[PDB]
């Protein structure tokens, strides 16, 4: 079993190679991506649609939810439903993000033939360049970590960090870029 | 604690009572609103934000899923989410569209300010006209229910079935208003 | 174009069949599997697991919603999510309801090994006695409409009003079942 | 802005972000990161958890992980939970509430159920002195210092640090629990 001192040692572990993945952003990310990622949402006048499943799913919402608190209107696809009519949400003027780490997530690769009929930009978030999501996106937004700390390498934890973390600075860019004010702030944050 | 015939007469007793609810639809909602909510959807430029609490929530996400079918872009907006800033999803161009059986559910009306502000079109439905929602309401959407099957007269089955049927009638008359077409629904419902 | 009377009477026909949809239940619902369905989740001691795709996903949130109402704990499992971890949420003394009209939806018959596996209860909702949820099911439980009220008869609309007609009368009668109190019921209703 | 200008203000998120998640061991309670490692792997039920807004997908991403690791989680929307939802909290069950101020009105309402139930409450917040912090049975410390939007509103690096702080939690579970491989293929097996 384990101790306090063994319990405490394993999570200090799990924290630095969190901490880790999040500074090595810039030596895993594309500086043209994230420039054409700026701009390219900054003058949207649809809405970002973002689909994921699992973990990748919970990083898909943190941006539709941050993407929102700065008038960047967003919404998520759940896969499921989104093969079943929920597609109708994605429209010409939109902005489709897939987050997928390898890329090639059968649930998501369904979703494609839609976005190219409806016309819509397609950002692939994967740290795959070889895979259908990097290849047929519009802007291929790559993101990756070296390490992740669980004991079988499969939670994709600092993996789902690193993609948050970096539309955080989108987001926290845009509001720059934007002229965001604290007034249309008060608007969607009344409590 | 019940024998196999008691547990049938009890079923059948709520879906009689559901299927009047549904059938006493021209009764409880106004044909004005009827006519104006499928004008007002159609002509829609931007998309169909639904919020509600509970069951009326998941009134909403039947809205949201059926309207989505049809090439209406919709999503829902949770109460608990929106006044923490997801109401930055609603714009100008959109409809609201706020489910309240009662009319004055606290976590709705603190949804109004914004839509006022942002200048979207609300629709209101409940079944009281003196609430908050019926008042502030661009179109009241009047749905009533006469008699709940539970034996509280609280769970609010019958008032939701009615809610769903109401726009399960605007979605379905839309795809004739709008010439819907198999070719749009098989882009949409490719499958798994 | 369509006048004000052909609005009304295409809004109208709608609610007539969607009403005699659920006035056939009892001609569309097995006996045995209505009493069985009641007497297994009175004697339930863990939670009702309840997946669907895109409408038979909302029939199942209904599900999920008016079970935690009467203190049957119940959660909605996102089949795009379920096969990436969260059918972890599934465990022994559960019951699990897939909500499949035709009862081949893949996204579905992915879920079944799992539950399997797990020992859970399956309660198979759908019109097809010889598809596969059908037949793996412990307890089949036919739900079915003749007519449906849209153009192309693919919304599915009857189905699904049906389909939650169906449990909002599994549940009611539960309330009498087990005795359910206004007591409990003020509890987890204080809004 | 210039190519540049993006990229400065970009690298400077993630630095004050990669400072939030480094700086954890100062910012949370050894004592609470030990006994919620020891209650979680305990639990007989499952982990309810609640949040607003940007806790809200923190919640989320704890619900989720927790099941990856055979703890059964399931996320509990505030403004469906004082309308049913709260059926789904049982005594055997651990309600965690996400709350960085700790006085989240929707999470406080849910409090007086989590007591006459006889759930364990884990409060998960900044303030010592709130609400959430006082009645929770382990109240879970976690902050950040710097927040790197610039209205010091986004919460994005302590999400990034609530989230962080489960990962730990979690990721010292598979070990603690003799989590096997055997056991993460049943529950991910894909969607071919």
Redesign the interface.
């Known amino acids: 079993?384990?101790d306090?001192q063994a319990?405490?040692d394993?999570?200090?572990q799990?924290?630095?190679e969190?901490?880790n993945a999040?500074?090595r952003?810039?030596e895993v990310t594309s500086?043209e991506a994230?420039?054409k990622t700026?701009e390219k949402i900054a003058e949207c006048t649809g809405?970002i649609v973002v689909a994921g499943?699992?973990?990748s799913?919970?990083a898909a919402?943190?941006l539709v939810?941050?993407?929102?608190?700065?008038?960047?209107?967003?919404?998520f696809l759940?896969?499921?439903?989104a093969?079943?009519?929920?597609?109708?949400?994605?429209?010409k003027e939109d902005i489709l993000i897939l987050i997928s780490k390898g890329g090639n997530?059968?649930?998501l690769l369904?979703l494609i033939?839609?976005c190219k009929?409806?016309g819509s930009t397609l950002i692939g978030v994967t740290e795959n360049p070889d895979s259908v999501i990097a290849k047929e996106a519009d802007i291929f937004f790559p993101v990756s970590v070296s390490k992740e700390?669980?004991?079988?390498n499969?939670?994709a934890?600092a993996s789902?960090?690193a993609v948050?973390?970096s539309f955080?600075?989108?987001?926290?860019?845009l509001?720059?870029?934007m002229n965001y004010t604290?007034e249309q702030?008060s608007?969607?944050?009344?409590?």
């Open positions: 079993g384990m306090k319990i405490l394993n999570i200090h799990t924290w630095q969190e901490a999040i500074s952003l810039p500086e994230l420039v700026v809405k499943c699992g973990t799913g919970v919402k943190k939810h941050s993407f929102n608190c700065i008038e960047r209107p967003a919404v759940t896969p499921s439903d093969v079943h009519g929920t597609l109708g949400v994605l429209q997530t059968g649930e369904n033939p839609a009929t409806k700390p669980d004991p079988f499969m939670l934890t789902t960090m948050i973390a955080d600075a989108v987001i926290v860019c509001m720059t870029y604290k702030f608007v969607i944050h009344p409590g």
